[PDB]
Structures are given as C-alpha cells and as structure tokens.
Design a protein around this ligand. Structure first.
Ligand SMILES: C/C(=C\c1csc(C)n1)[C@@H]1C[C@@H]2O[C@]2(C)CCC[C@H](C)[C@H](O)[C@@H](C)C(=O)C(C)(C)[C@@H](O)CC(=O)O1
Ligand SMILES: C/C(=C\c1csc(C)n1)[C@@H]1C[C@@H]2O[C@]2(C)CCC[C@H](C)[C@H](O)[C@@H](C)C(=O)C(C)(C)[C@@H](O)CC(=O)O1
Ligand SMILES: Nc1nc2c(ncn2[C@@H]2O[C@H](COP(=O)(O)OP(=O)(O)OP(=O)(O)O)[C@@H](O)[C@H]2O)c(=O)[nH]1
Ligand SMILES: Nc1nc2c(ncn2[C@@H]2O[C@H](COP(=O)(O)OP(=O)(O)OP(=O)(O)O)[C@@H](O)[C@H]2O)c(=O)[nH]1
Ligand SMILES: Nc1nc2c(ncn2[C@@H]2O[C@H](COP(=O)(O)OP(=O)(O)O)[C@@H](O)[C@H]2O)c(=O)[nH]1
Ligand SMILES: Nc1nc2c(ncn2[C@@H]2O[C@H](COP(=O)(O)OP(=O)(O)O)[C@@H](O)[C@H]2O)c(=O)[nH]1
Ligand SMILES: [Mg+2]
Ligand SMILES: [Mg+2]
Ligand SMILES: [Mg+2]
Ligand SMILES: [Mg+2]
Lengths: 439, 428, 439, 428
C-alpha cells in the first residue's frame, strides 16, 4: 500500500545506493541472492519490505530502484557484485559516454538520447505499485551527470505525474576540498532545477563527514566507503516509520508540511547521533538527554556551516529504539531554556517528535557500534546561506575571466543562462535573510 | 431503554476509546470473546445502553472507529479486547490527514464522511430510545480535529434534539509535539461552541502532573493516561447503568451545569488517587474524598481554578454512604470557599449517589466543574495563533486545500468572544 | 364502606409509599406476598383493612395505590423486591424519559403522554370503591416530575370529581441543604396547584428530621430509609381513626372542619412524639402530660421554622394507646397557662382531641422503640410565613440574571408565567400575616 | 295507661341512652335476653310505659336510634344489653355530620328525617294513650345538635299536645374538645326555647367534679358520667312506674315548675353520693339527704345556685319515710335560705313521695331546680359566639351547606333575649 521509488543517478548515487540497499536488506533479513529465509519467511511483512522491495513468484524479492548512469564502469561493479541476483537486469541502465563534468553533455548532447528508456522503466514500476508516496533521487552537484541528467530527468517526472513528493539527496561541494575545475559552474547551473521541482532537498558536505569519522569514530583516514555507510543511516531512519511500527509515526507526506513555512525555503540539514566506537560505548552511558545535546552541537552537524551564526526555523526529531515520550518532553524543554540555541520569533513551537520501536541495525564490519538509541535531526536554519555564499564567490571569480565557458557553450549552453542562474541563486539568499528578519 | 452511541476519531480517540471499553467490559463482567461471566443480575439489567445483544449470548459494542489511516485500526484489532468490536464498524482511510485540519474537513473527510454516516445512521433504528452521542478526538491533530468536527455537524442536523458529548483533549502550553497545534485547535473551537451541549477538556500536561505527584509513578505511559480518562467517563454515566438513591442522567446533569448555551466547557476530576505505599495509611470517608476533589492538584486541566469563581459544580458519588454526611461536606466547602464560588446563584453543587461502587474500591466520586478559569487555556492558544498568522506561516499548506484567509479570522474572532463572556460574568 | 386512595408520584413518592405500605401490612397482619393468616390474625375486617386493602378472589389483598414515575429505574426495584406480589402490575405505571429537573417537561411535554393512562387506573379503582373519602398524594417540590406531573394530575382530578377532599404530602426544600440548582424555580411554579386544587397540604423538611434523629434517636448518620419511616408514622396515625376503633374518632372531613379557618389558609405542620431509643425508654416514663409538652417544643417539630416567632390559629391533637379523657383535659389546661405559647384572640377554643385504642406498631429492624402512647400534632400557625420568605429570596436573585430560564422556555414555558407565580406567592404570605395581626 | 317514647340522637345520646335502658331493665328485673326474672308483682304493673310486650314473655323498648354514622350502632349492638332492642329501630346514616350543625338540618338531615318519622308514627299508634317523648343528644356536636333539633320540630307539629323532654348536655366552660362548639350551641338553642316543653342541662365539667370530690374516684370514665345521668332520668319518671303516697306525673311537675313558657331550664341533681370508705360513717336519714340537695358541689351544672335565686324547686322522694319529716325540713330550708328564694312566690318547694326504693339503697331522692343562675351559662356562650363571628372565622363551611349569615345574627339575638328575661325576674 505504502510504496516508494528510489532513483540513483551518477557514480556517487550508485555508490551510495549500493551501501544503502545493503543496509535495507539486513534490516528486513533478505539475503543478497533475493530469497527471504525461514527466519522471516514473509511473516508480518505487509509493509516491512513492500515499501522498498516487491514480491515476485516465490522466494524472490526485487527492489524498486532504477540505476541510470552515463558510464558502464560503475554499473559493471553492481552487475558483478554479490547483489547482482537481487537487482533486475533491466532496472540497471548504463550509458556509452559520461558527461565529462559538463552540465550540457548530460542535458542536451547525451541526456535526451537515453532518457527515453529511463522513462519507460519508471512507468513500468509505477503501474505495479498501488499507492506511491513519492520518489527518492540521489546525485551530486559537482558531477556533470548528477547535474545535467538529474535536471532533465526531474523536469520530465513533474510533467508526467506532478502530484507526488520528490525528495532529493545531494552532495554539496566542499568549501576547500575539491577534485574538479568546473565544480562552481556545475553546482550553480543545477540550483534552479532543485528549487523549482524538488519539495525538499537534504544537503551534506564531505568535509563534515570526514571530521565526524576522524574524531567521533576514531579513524585515522576515512574512506568514501565509510562515508556512504553513514549516509545510509539517516535515509534508513527517515523511512523507518513507514516500514516499522511505533508509538508516534511520521509519514513521508508530513516532512514537508512540518519543515517548510514557505515554498522557496526547502533546504534543511541532517544530523545523526550518537556516533561512537565499541570501545567508547563501554565507557559512555547513552541517555535520551545526552543524544539530544549532541544533535544540537555544531561539531556533530553534517554541514560545515555554523548553526550558531544563524537561527532555527523548523526542527524535526526522530527517535528509534527504546524511547519513552516522557524523556523526550523533558529533554526538549531544557533545549528551549538554553540561550545559545536561538529560535525564530514567529515560530513558538518548532519541535516534532517521532518514536519508532525498531532499534538501529549495525552492519557487520562497520565502524558504528551497537547502541540502543538513535536520534535523527532534520532542522531548517538560515545558516545554510553561508555555504551557498562560498560557492557563489568562486563562480563570480571564474565567470569574470570566462574560463572553461567555451566548453559549456560548445555543447549547447549560452551565456544568458549563467547570468540567470546567478540572479536566481542570489534571490534565494536574499529571501532566506528576508524571512529571518525579526519583527 | 436509554442507549448511547460512541464514536472514535483519530489516533488519540482510538487509543482512549479502546481503553474505555475495557473498563466498561470489566464493570459489566464481559469477557473479551463476548460472553457474560458476571455474578450479579444488575450487570445485565442495563447492559443495552452500551452493548447490543446478539445470538449465542454474544454482545457487540455500539461503537464506531473512524480514522484516515489503517495503522491505528490494525493495532486496535490485534490488541486486547479487539475482536469484541463488530468488523463492519471498522471504516478507515488510506491517504491520511498529515496533521492538517483542512484535509480532514474538506479534502479527505468528504470522501469518507458518507461511508461513516451509513454506520451511525443504521444503529439508530435498532436503538429503542437513543439519548445522545459521545465522540473522542484530539484538537491538536488533523484527523480527529478536522474530520471528527465535520461528523458533529452532520449528526446535529439529522438529530437536533439529542445531547452531544465530546471527551476531547486540548493542546498543552509547554508540551507540544506538533508545529501546527494552534491552527488546528482554533479552527475546531468555532464549530464545537455551536453544535455541542457539553465539552470536557483534557490536558496531557495536567495528567502527567497527577501521575508524578498524586500517584508517585516512576515512569508514565500513554495507557496510564488513558486509564484516568476512561475512569472519568464511567463515573459520568453510572446512573444510567446502575440504580441509586438519587439518580441523575446526562440530561439531568446538563441542565444543572450550563446556565447559558454558550458556556458549556467543564473540567473533569476523579478521586481518590493514592500510591501503593500510602494505601494502608489513608482512610475511606466522605470528607477524605471531598478534600481531594476540590484540590487544584487533582484537576485534569492545566487551568488553576483558584484564579476564578466556580459557576456550577457537579458531583456523582458511587458506593454506600449516608446522605447526611455528603449533604454537609459540599455545603461546608461552599461556605468556607465563599470567594471561590459565584454569588448570584445560592447553590452551585449538584449531588448524585450511585449504589454500585467501582471495582476494587469501596467508595469513589467524579468531580465536574464549570469554573471561569477555563478562559486562560483559550487565551494562550490565541497568542500562538496570532503570532504565526502575523507572518502568514504555514498558511499556504492550509490554503492549498481550498481554505480562505478570511475563514481563519472568523475563528479567531469567535474565540475572543468566548473568553469575553466567561470573564464578563466572572467579573460581574 | 369508607375507603381512601393513595397516589405516589416521582422518586420521593415511591420510596415513601414503599415504607408506608410496609407498616400498613404489618399493622393489619398481611404478608408481603398477599395472603393474610386469618386463622391466627383474628380481626373484625369491616374497616380494619377494607379502607386501604381490597379483597379479590380468595385470601388476596391488593393495596388501593397507584405508583407513577417518569423513569423506570425507581419502579423496577419495587417490581423486583420483596413486595412485588403485593401490588397489581397494572397499578405501577412507568415512563421512558424523566423531567430532568424541569417543570415544563413534566407538565407540558412528558406529562401529557401518559396522563390518559394514569386517569384510567384511578377511574377503575373508583368504580370498585363504594364510598370514597378522599385522595392522598405523595410528591416533592424540588423535582420536576414531583412538581410538574403532580400539578397536572390534580387539575384532572379536580375536574373529574370536584367533590372529594384531597390531602397533600410534600417535602419542602431545606434552607441550607439542597441537591439541585433549579430547586427555587420548581417550588414557585408548583404553588398554583397547592393553593387552589389541594384542600390541605402537609409540609415536611429533610433538614429538621436529620436533627431529630441525631439528638432524639441518637443516630449519627441517618439515611433516607430512616427519614421515610418517621414520615410513615405520621400518615398511619392520621388515618388510624378510619381503620380502627376508639372513644373519639376524627375522619378526613372533620380534619378540615376545625383546621381551615379560611379557604386560602390550608398549610399546617405535623409533629410526632415521643421519639426515643430503647436505651432511654427504660430510664424515663411516658406520661400523657410529658408527651404533650414535647410536641409543643420547637426542637421536636418536623419543620425547620420557629413556631415561637409566629402564633397558633388552630390545633388538633390525636391520641393513641391507653389514653384517658381525664388526663387530656388536665394537660390541655397546663398548655393554655404557659405564656410562651400564644394563640389568636378571635379563636377562644382551638383544640381538637381524638383518642384511639390501637397502640403504635414497631417495624422489626427499625429505629423507634416500643411505646404505649403516641400523639400526632397538626397545628396551623402563622410561623409558616417565614418559610416562604427564604424560598422567595433565592428565586428573585436567580430570576434577575435569567439563569437557566432558557431551559424552561424551550420546553413550552413563557417568561410571563414566572412573574405570575411570584405574585401568588407574595399574596399568600401577605394573607398569613394579616390574619395574625391582633385586633 | 301512659306510654313514653324514647329517642336517641348523636354519639353522646346513644351512649347515655344505652346506659339508661340498663338501669331501667335492672329496676324492672329484665334480663338482657328480654325475659322477666324478677321476684315481685309491682315490677310488671306499669311495664307498658317503657317496654312493649312481644311473643312468649319477651319485651322490647320504645327506643329509636338515630345517627348519621354506623359506628355508634355497631358498638351499641355488640355491647351489653344491645341485642334486647328491636333491629328495625336501628336507623343510621353513612356519611356523617362532621361535628357540623348545618349538615344534619338542611343538607343531609332531610334525607333521613322521613325514614325516622315513619318509625315514630308506627310506635305512636301502638300506645293506648301516649304522654310524651324524651330525647337524649348533645348540643356541642353536629349530628345530635342538628338532627335532634329537626326531629323536635317535626314531632311537635304532628302531636302539639304531648310533653317534650330533652336531656341535652351543653359545652363546658373550660373542657372543650371541638373548635366550632359556640356556633353549634347557639344555633340549637334558638329552636329548643320555642319547641321543647322543658330542658335539662348537664355539664361534663360538673360531672367530673362530682366524681373527684363527692365520689372520691381516682380515674373517672365516660361510663361513670352516663350512670349519673341515667339515675336522674329514673327518678323523674318513678311515679308513673311505681305507686306512691303522693305521686306526680310529668304533666303535674311541669305545671308546678314553669311559671312562664320561656322559662323552662332546670338543673338536675341526685342524692346521696358517698365514697366506698364513707359508707360506715354516713347515716341514711331524711335530714342528711335534704342537706345534700341544697349544695353547690352536688349540682350537675357549672352554675352556682348561690349566685342567683331559686324560682321553683321540685324534689321526688323514693323509699319509706314519714310525711311529717319531709313536710318540715323543706320549710326550714326555705326559711333559712329566704335570701335565695323569690318573694312573690309564697311556696317554692314541690314534694313528691314514692314508695318503691331503688336497687341496693334503702332511701333515695332526686333534686330538680329552676333558678336564675342558669343565665350565666348562656352568657359565656354568647361571648364566645361574638368573638368568632366578628372575624367570620369557620363560616364558609356553614355557608356552603345552604344557610345564610343573617341566620346567625337572629340566633344570637334570641339567646340574648332569653338571659334578659331571667335578669328582670331576679333583679326585681
Ligand atoms: C484502588 C486504588 C486506590 C485506593 C485504594 S484505598 C485508597 C485510599 N486508595 C487505585 C485503583 C483505582 O482504579 C484506579 C482508578 C486506578 C487507575 C489506574 C492507575 C491510574 C494506573 O494506571 C495503575 C496502572 C497504577 O499505577 C496502580 C499502581 C495499579 C494504581 O491503580 C494503584 C491502585 O490500586 O489505585
Ligand atoms: C350504693 C351507693 C351508695 C351508698 C350506699 S349507702 C350510702 C350512704 N351510700 C352508690 C350507688 C348509687 O346509686 C348510685 C347513684 C349509682 C351511681 C354510680 C356511682 C356514682 C359510680 O359511678 C359507680 C360506677 C362506682 O364507682 C361504684 C363502684 C358503683 C360505687 O363506688 C359508687 C357508690 O358509692 O355506690
Ligand atoms: N559519498 C560519496 N560521494 C562520492 C563517491 N564517489 C564520488 N562521490 C562524489 O562525486 C564527485 C565526483 O564526481 P561524480 O559525482 O561521480 O560525477 P558524475 O555524477 O559521475 O558525473 P560525470 O563526472 O560527468 O560523469 C565527488 O566530488 C564526490 O563528492 C562515493 O563513493 N561516496
Ligand atoms: N425524605 C426523602 N426525600 C427524598 C427521597 N428521595 C428523594 N427525595 C427528595 O427528592 C429530591 C430529589 O428530586 P426528586 O423529588 O426525586 O425528583 P423527581 O420527583 O424524581 O422528579 P425529577 O427530578 O424530574 O425526575 C431530593 O432533594 C430529596 O429531598 C427519599 O427517599 N426520602
Ligand atoms: N492522552 C493521550 N494523548 C495522546 C495519545 N496519542 C497521542 N496523543 C496526543 O495527541 C496529539 C497528536 O494527535 P493525533 O493523534 O496526531 O491526532 P490525529 O492526527 O487526528 O490522529 C499529541 O500531541 C499527543 O500528545 C494517547 O494515547 N493518549
Ligand atoms: N358524659 C358523656 N359525654 C359524652 C359522651 N360521648 C360524647 N360526649 C360529649 O360529646 C361531645 C362530642 O359530641 P359528638 O359525639 O361529636 O356529637 P355528634 O356530632 O352528634 O356525634 C364531647 O365534648 C363529649 O364531652 C358520653 O358517653 N358521656
Ligand atoms: Mg561519471
Ligand atoms: Mg497522531
Ligand atoms: Mg426522577
Ligand atoms: Mg362525637
């Protein structure tokens, strides 16, 4: 009944999707081959896996995910890995040539040639489901495929259905760490399509996750694989209420109405706590109040921006495990008393509480320790504007000299859109500060 | 003879209503399957008020469960005393309200209101002489506050001569798990003040205080809070189910409670409530129960009655006690607390005595008070509503469902008038 | 040849009637089921039970009483308890909805629904009645049914017969003790039937009986059952002359001959003595002079008013037991010599003496002790006017703010009716004061 | 030769009349069954005056019982000497008068007067030569005072030549058992003075005083009072039933008693009266009996003879005494009490001697006296009537029966005229 469709585009999207789907299968008990063992044997799984997977024949489950990318090398790993049997061959869509870090290549040069096959696959999955809660898209702003193909695909989805939520998980370019020379161009060009179509976009920065894994998890050198393992936990916790029972449940259609006060302000952040190792777990006593304090700590946040500079507008609190409502009420009361955390004047109540019975599941071989409680924080703040300000400054310096602009122009871009993107991006920052102005 | 139709709306109403039927079944000695296993003839004498007799000595409740989500119904069906309810009484939606009043009343409720109107209509012809309807819903939610309010108007038009009861909770001042609580609460008071004869206010913050100090419980539970509400529900209609020296039904209590049609908001209360350790030290006398009933700590609402004058007070006694003792206790309370009661009414106390005591208790009493301090609860809701309406916060979500800005203003104006009338007579 | 019919209306009337008929059967030796053991209970039978019990078939005695109530809860106990077989099932008439403390409901809305049925039962009993002396009605002023249905019932009886004296037994509301908020409204509206239709109204107060039981009967916490037993003794002594034999007998007609100086003055009060426990019976002598003095004291009166403030107009004394006429004459002289007691100048002789032979009967398991003498006092005094003043003050304050008026109006009442009843109450009080003025 | 018809009206008349027949039966030696068990011939010589011969050797009195209630007849029939009366003579009503004079004269008295007139007419023709009628009733009641007055007027018209005797009691000054006594007494007096040849006034208070000081009895009873009245009745008519040296019938006494038609009120008395412990020290001589006659405490009326003057005195002696003694003591009393006797009447003493003594006594006598002191009794009645008639108290009951207010005024005026006539004779 409650069903969702996840779409992964780009090398980053597939890599994160591979880690996320591994977590999803283990939470339900599905083996990598796709057969449900006698431990679960489709017992009480009306919504446990129907929301993510689908039942085909007997002793076989297929996920409702579409893997589309412009290069076959990343898709080859999935088709060669252990989870090849679990996925359907037609769902995994490959390509001939990548976007080569060019927004136009994934939009005009190559995007429309292969987008026809992607649309049919989504339609086939949609007909199988009865009630579609929404869509999930994973991509990266810096990548050309994650900025060009995603922009074109998202527009077509709104044309077809135009009535279902489309949550977006994107990786924002780091203020200092970079591996490309056209990141400001790609990042700016995709801001308009995210604001126009996506109802809620969660932004993460690789630098922040690196520090969390280095310090909190005590890792000398974090890797990309370890980063993806953390990312799956927020996504699993976000959709935990849809698949598992609990005292207070929040559905996918309640995130938007309780987070965005205006259609333009739809860029919240994410925070996960507690994140500790097994050794630290024995010497630390986890409590409801302790985890809540960690979530509000700027150090533990997943965004390089400092929340204390800005103000909080809307906050969400999702609890998993043995969590009682009484402890949460006392914990949130102390947060409001603290002077350091500032709330918007016109928002008297900005706390949403959700409790799930299912405790977090620890994947074997992961650095995460077994903890009976976990809190997922989805807060909308005006401090996110600083991150946008950094990338905007870099774009102005590059656009002034018009370096590498001819690369975009050759594939079909025009200088007018670049100026329009800056105007649209500047309006978003101005509107963010305008709403933050007090009475 | 006289029967009552029960309606459950929203997640809060379903959970509270489920616990309410457990108390009634225990009082009437009905096993979960539906067979009578009692040891008294009085239990079956007036069992038709809440249970409909069926074949093979089986009884089904006259209750209807209404919600826009199937999750709540599945838990109730699989829970204790779940198979007792009639399967045809399970009417549920598939989309949900999402804590939105507009969706429940306009967008989603209209599709399902017709289906639930069939079930409630069908019970009436089977009913010999219906007395009224009691509905449980939460004002802070979207389903119970939104769609449940619409059901009140539909029943009122069909039956404009029957009393309407609404055992509903209200948003707490400090406790708040939703962002749009003031928007939903304000839009529900406008309809309740017109199509309801008596309203009972329940505060979650007040319930926690009772379970912390009065009961000395270590950890509270939502089931524990629902047990207090169900206990108050049983004590209100004990006269209609069991005989007594002085009987008073809902209509008899209603006329003595409301001096004016608009002033129909009451605060409930139950006594005695003691911890396990203090059970062996307290005594069971009428003065002991009277002191707890007239205590601010025992009130089920966040409002403190000491800040206003009591207009009318309703007290129903359960058990065996002398009429002389109960007559003096309420008279002494009024005489001592002269400044705490209204002046232009000589007597503000209604006394009812029920012979049958509650299970596991020699004596008990339920306190109902129409105090003038209830306007403070509406005052704090108005401040929250004005602050968010000034910045037009979250108004587009409500507007997208077909609502208008002027409709919100009308609800605010009506709420301001309600607190003016309560203050006018109090300060008269 | 001489018989009477008793009517009980409302919750209060039924309970009093149950206690009254319990003593009536015991006095005549009638078992609760209905068989009288005439083999051992040797009696005349001409008027011992024919006045109240009518023989039917062989060895069956049914009371000449009608039980009317708008709620079935009270009557169902009578139809279930020990005395179920005593009463004819058709004599017990039940309704469906009570008056809910509303005079209009019991007189304008619900009274008209079952008024035809109750009149038919009275007519059926009247046909079997060779000669009927009068009707006795039991009700309460505070209750809606006791004030509304009773007022409608007496208006039909007055039109139907118009030549039989009707006696009224009502419970006057207490000054400081009350069980309802709308009591003053009901009391004022029910004065019309008690002033024009009723030929004699007997008023009792619950508060006064509570004090008597506490001090005389040494009962710390008396209940309703004890209160009804004392009231039942008053009715038994009044009708004892018509049922038994004595040197001087006073009937119903003779009661109004000497106790009604004016047609609009028919509100006397009742006093019973001696009432003592078994402990004090052995340590005291119950002489004729002693019991007579106790009746004139204000502490033994069944009403909360003060007789010393007012003046006596007409007095009636009923004697039961081994009472000799010589002792009564001496006792009367001592009463007339005390200067505390005052009498009106226009009435030189205001004493009526009735001596019976049957001693008082004690119900097993009761509170009263066995005695050989008993005096029933019925005196019409001007101190009753003080009782009207207390009820008038409450009505004026409530009607000033128009409290609970809309409940009566919506059921068929008018605002002008309340004003009309106020004038009648004031006129009745004025007439009482005028007669007491010395010439 | 001469026959007397007895009529009993009211509760008081029936009880007094029942005791009167028992005394007569004892004197004539008649057992309760009705046969003769005497041991003398003079007992049956004049038995026709009171008893009617029946089949075998049974005798029945010429007594008619009239009442508006059946209770009195049941007690008389079931009592001693109750089955000796004729069953057909029992006439009783069913509603009663309710101590109201107007009920027995205009409203309900007319519905039974025809029935009782048939019986008395049937008894009248049986007597060879009837002499008169005697009636026992009470002026303070409703039945005897009202119905008895109507019977006197009706009987007088049929036989205007026969003597009328009324043994009627009057309300006492201090002892009173009814509130409306003054109204009844005044109304009945208006007719007695114009239709009755002679009346005998008996006061209940005076009877109690006699049994308290003269008889020295501890607990007097209504039977004791009735015995004194019955003894007087036998003494009055002892000459008709038994022979004597100087006999005087009812007509002979009446001629010597009343000097004027309107002055026919007498006070009765009997001698001797001694206690049970004073029998030894008491001498049964003519001087002793004569002294007791002219004594204040021996009178059966509350009026004091010394206050006024004796108009005419008639005494009847029973037994065997010398005529020389009885002809001297009365002359000595008249000379010694010359201040208490009228001047224009030379001799004020009438002497009658009978031979047959009573039962158990060697000598006995009765005293009958006409004095002006009886005006005091009517003076108090007039004062009571004016006080109650001033405010029209207890008048609607009398008015509703059909009478008029002016009727009360006429009765009061006539009674005031009666005492005025007594005033003029004594003062002059
Ligand atoms: C019997 C009694 C009190 C009492 C007897 S003599 C005296 C003085 N006071 C009450 C039970 C009563 O039924 C309610 C309303 C009890 C209502 C249920 C309460 C609110 C809790 O949910 C419940 C689980 C409890 O915490 C417990 C400890 C079991 C309580 O009910 C304890 C307990 O026995 O409390
Ligand atoms: C016989 C006699 C007196 C007497 C004889 S020689 C003498 C001198 N005096 C009288 C009866 C007397 O005939 C009457 C008048 C009869 C009068 C009856 C008297 C007055 C009482 O009422 C009566 C009932 C009594 O109490 C009794 C017990 C009969 C007696 O005490 C009354 C009592 O003294 O008896
Ligand atoms: N979290 C996470 N991010 C990754 C991973 N691999 C690549 N990325 C992100 O992806 C960026 C590299 O470019 P891609 O997003 O792969 O480019 P693309 O979407 O394939 O588009 P083209 O380069 O034009 O083919 C880096 O800046 C990373 O931020 C990964 O394994 N985990
Ligand atoms: N003495 C005595 N009084 C009673 C008893 N029962 C009820 N009452 C009186 O009755 C009042 C309660 O109202 P009721 O008289 O019963 O009212 P009702 O006649 O049933 O009419 P409704 O209230 O309209 O149904 C109390 O205030 C008592 O004074 C009783 O058993 N004994
Ligand atoms: N007393 C009580 N309150 C509850 C319960 N469940 C939820 N609530 C309260 O109800 C509010 C949410 O109302 P909700 O259930 O969402 O209303 P709905 O959307 O109409 O179903 C929260 O603030 C809770 O405090 C319960 O079982 N008992
Ligand atoms: N001496 C005497 N007086 C009586 C007797 N019975 C009644 N009385 C008097 O009669 C008065 C009452 O008269 P009542 O019987 O009512 O007259 P009724 O209405 O004609 O029956 C009382 O005051 C008594 O004093 C009796 O047996 N003896
Ligand atoms: Mg790539
Ligand atoms: Mg909810
Ligand atoms: Mg009632
Ligand atoms: Mg009498």
């Amino acid at each position: 009944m409650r069903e969702c469709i996840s779409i992964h585009v780009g090398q980053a999207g597939v890599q994160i999707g591979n880690a996320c789907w591994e977590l999803y299968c283990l939470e339900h008990g599905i083996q990598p081959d796709g057969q449900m063992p006698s431990d679960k044997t489709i017992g009480g799984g009306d919504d446990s896996f129907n929301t993510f997977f689908s039942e085909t024949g007997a002793g076989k489950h297929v996920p409702r995910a579409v893997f589309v990318d412009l290069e076959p090398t990343v898709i080859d790993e999935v088709r060669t890995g252990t989870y090849r049997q679990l996925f359907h061959p037609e769902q995994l869509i490959t390509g001939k040539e990548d976007a080569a870090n060019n927004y136009a290549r994934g939009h005009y040069t190559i995007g429309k040639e292969i987008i026809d096959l992607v649309l049919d696959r989504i339609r086939k999955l949609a007909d199988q489901c009865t009630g579609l809660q929404g869509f999930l898209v994973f991509h990266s702003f810096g990548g050309g495929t994650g900025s060009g193909f995603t922009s074109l695909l998202m527009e077509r989805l709104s044309v077809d259905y135009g009535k279902k939520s489309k949550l977006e998980f994107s990786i924002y370019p780091a203020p200092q760490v970079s591996t490309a020379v056209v990141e400001p161009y790609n990042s700016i060009l995709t801001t308009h399509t995210t604001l126009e179509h996506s109802d809620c976009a969660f932004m993460v920065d690789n630098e922040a996750i690196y520090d969390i894994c280095r310090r909190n998890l005590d890792i000398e050198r974090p890797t990309y694989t370890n980063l993806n393992r953390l990312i799956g936990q927020i996504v699993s916790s976000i959709t935990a209420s849809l698949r598992f029972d609990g005292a207070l449940n929040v559905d996918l259609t309640e995130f938007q109405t309780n987070l965005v006060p205006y259609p333009r302000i739809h860029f919240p952040l994410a925070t996960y706590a507690p994140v500790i190792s097994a050794e630290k777990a024995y010497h630390e006593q986890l409590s409801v109040a302790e985890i809540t304090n960690a979530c509000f700590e700027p150090a533990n946040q997943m965004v390089k921006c400092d929340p204390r500079h800005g103000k909080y507008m809307a906050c969400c609190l999702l609890y998993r495990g043995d969590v009682v409502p009484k402890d949460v009420n006392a914990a949130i009361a102390t947060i409001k008393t603290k002077r350091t955390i500032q709330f918007v004047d016109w928002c008297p109540t900005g706390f949403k509480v959700g409790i799930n019975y299912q405790p977090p599941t620890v994947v074997p071989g992961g650095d995460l320790a077994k903890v009976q409680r976990a809190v997922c924080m989805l807060s909308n703040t005006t401090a996110i504007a600083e991150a946008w300000a950094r990338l905007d400054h870099k774009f102005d310096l590059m656009y002034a000299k018009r370096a590498f602009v001819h690369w975009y122009v050759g594939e079909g871009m025009e200088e007018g859109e670049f100026s329009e993107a800056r105007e649209d991006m500047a309006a978003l920052e101005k509107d963010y500060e305008e709403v933050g102005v007090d009475s | 003879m006289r029967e009552i139709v029960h309606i459950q709306a929203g997640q809060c109403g379903n959970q509270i209503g489920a616990k309410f039927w457990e108390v009634i079944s225990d009082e009437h000695g009905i096993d979960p399957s539906g067979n009578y296993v009692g040891d008294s003839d009085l239990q079956l004498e007036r069992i038709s008020v809440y249970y409909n007799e069926a074949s093979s000595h089986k009884y089904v409740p006259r209750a209807i469960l209404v919600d826009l989500e199937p999750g709540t119904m599945d838990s109730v069906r699989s829970g204790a005393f779940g198979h007792l309810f009639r399967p045809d009484n399970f009417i549920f939606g598939q989309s949900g309200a999402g804590n939105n009043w507009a969706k429940g009343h306009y967008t989603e409720g209209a599709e399902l209101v017709d289906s639930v109107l069939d079930v409630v209509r069908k019970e009436c012809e089977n009913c010999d002489c219906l007395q009224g309807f009691q509905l449980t819903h939460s004002l802070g939610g979207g389903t119970g506050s939104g769609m449940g309010t619409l059901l009140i108007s539909k029943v009122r038009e069909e039956y404009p001569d029957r009393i309407m009861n609404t055992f509903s909770v209200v948003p707490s001042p400090k406790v708040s798990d939703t962002v749009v609580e003031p928007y939903n609460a304000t839009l529900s008071i406008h309809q309740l003040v017109e199509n309801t004869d008596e309203t009972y206010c329940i505060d979650n913050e007040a319930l926690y205080d009772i379970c912390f100090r009065t009961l000395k419980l270590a950890t509270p539970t939502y089931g524990d809070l629902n047990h207090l509400v169900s206990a108050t529900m049983s004590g209100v209609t004990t006269s209609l189910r069991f005989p007594g020296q002085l009987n008073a039904d809902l209509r008899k209590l209603a006329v003595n409670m409301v001096p004016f049609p608009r002033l129909h908001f009451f605060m409930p209360g139950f006594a005695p409530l003691t911890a396990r350790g203090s059970q062996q030290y307290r005594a069971l006398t009428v003065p002991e129960l009277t002191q707890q009933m007239f205590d601010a700590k025992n009130m089920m609402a966040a409002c403190d009655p000491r800040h206003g004058r009591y207009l009318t007070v309703a007290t129903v006694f359960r058990g065996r006690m002398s009429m002389k003792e109960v007559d003096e206790q309420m008279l002494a309370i009024q005489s001592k607390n002269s400044s705490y009661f209204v002046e232009w009414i000589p007597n503000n106390v209604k006394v009812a005595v029920c012979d049958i005591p509650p299970r596991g208790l020699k004596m008990s009493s339920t306190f109902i008070g129409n105090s003038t301090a209830i306007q403070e609860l509406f005052k704090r809701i108005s401040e929250q509503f004005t602050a968010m309406f000034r910045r037009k916060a979250f108004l587009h979500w409500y507007t997208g469902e077909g609502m208008d800005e002027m409709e919100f203003t009308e609800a605010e104006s009506n709420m301001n008038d309600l607190v003016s009338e309560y203050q006018q007579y109090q300060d008269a």
